Design a protein around this ligand. Structure first.
Ligand code: GLU
Ligand code: ZN
Length: 290
């Protein structure tokens, strides 16, 4: 009954590239097709890996490509109190613990945590915070791909919520912020499929409503290899041929003679003609984007 709310949540570790344009465009078109809101959140939660100016570049790029968000941009750098608040609640509820294990130790036992500190009652001193999983989620529904079966060992891990170095974990921040922003459906890149079950486990532990999920096509280079595996910035010039290429990647109708249309017209038509079922599970990008 309530309005659809979707979002694009880029990390400012670089400017937009074709893969992140796919995520922005796919989430935008699905949100607009569903007559819903489309939010933008800057995930600037890791200062060291952030590039000064990149977040602003991204927002400017979105506008250049005709993708206008609703309301104000949320900045994770302004949400640290919210992550702290959620961690405090988990601790009071008996749903988290402090872990003093080294990376060397975890590597030596196969790379997946064994729950060593689960009942040792360490304090927060020089410790990471781990979630105390109860009933890990190992499968989820993707509205496009159907039921996904996750890697069981990774899915069942008491994963990190707050790193030893003090940074809040992505899995924590994304759940806290999507819930805070009232996100009802998460439409995002294929590279984010695996952590989905952990995020769902976390919604369940908070006692919050689990949103819907759509993972967009896996991007391949022309040789058929994963594109994400190690990317040219989006052209600063005419965005139209790039938008047309992105629509084609998403299996949508794409006007070959884009010269007689504005960016806004191309997008308006893309919303009207959006067919989620036409979005493929993988797609090959052209050489211009590899
Ligand atoms: N900033 C993260 C979050 C993605 C998401 O959950 O939509 C990324 O771009 O990889
Ligand atoms: Zn430990």
């Amino acid at each position: 009954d309530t309005q659809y709310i979707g979002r694009f949540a880029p990390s400012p570790s670089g400017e937009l590239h074709f893969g992140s344009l796919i995520a922005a465009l796919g989430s935008y078109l699905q949100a607009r097709a569903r007559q819903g809101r489309w939010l933008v959140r800057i995930e600037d939660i890791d200062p060291p890996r952030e590039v000064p100016g990149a977040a602003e570049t991204i927002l400017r790029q979105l506008e250049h490509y005709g993708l206008h968000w609703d309301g104000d941009v949320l900045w994770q750098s302004q949400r640290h109190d919210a992550y702290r608040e959620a961690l405090a609640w988990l601790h009071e509820q008996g749903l988290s613990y402090y872990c003093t294990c080294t990376r060397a130790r975890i590597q030596s036992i196969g790379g997946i945590y064994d729950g060593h500190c689960r009942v040792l009652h360490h304090g927060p001193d020089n410790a990471a915070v781990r979630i105390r999983q109860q009933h890990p989620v190992t499968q989820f529904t993707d509205q496009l791909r159907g039921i996904i079966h996750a890697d069981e060992k990774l899915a069942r891990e008491d994963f990190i919520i707050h790193r030893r170095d003090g940074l809040f974990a992505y899995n924590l921040a994304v759940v806290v912020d999507d819930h805070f922003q009232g996100v009802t459906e998460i439409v995002r890149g294929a590279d984010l499929i695996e952590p989905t079950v952990r995020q769902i486990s976390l919604y369940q532990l908070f006692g919050w409503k689990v949103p819907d999920y759509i993972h967009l096509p896996l991007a391949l280079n022309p040789q058929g290899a994963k594109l994400s595996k190690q990317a040219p910035a989006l052209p600063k010039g005419d965005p139209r041929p790039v938008l047309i290429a992105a629509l084609q990647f998403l299996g949508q109708q794409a006007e070959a003679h884009w010269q007689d249309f504005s960016v806004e017209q191309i997008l308006q038509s893309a919303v009207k003609n959006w067919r989620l079922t036409a979005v493929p599970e993988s797609a090959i990008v052209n050489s211009t984007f590899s």
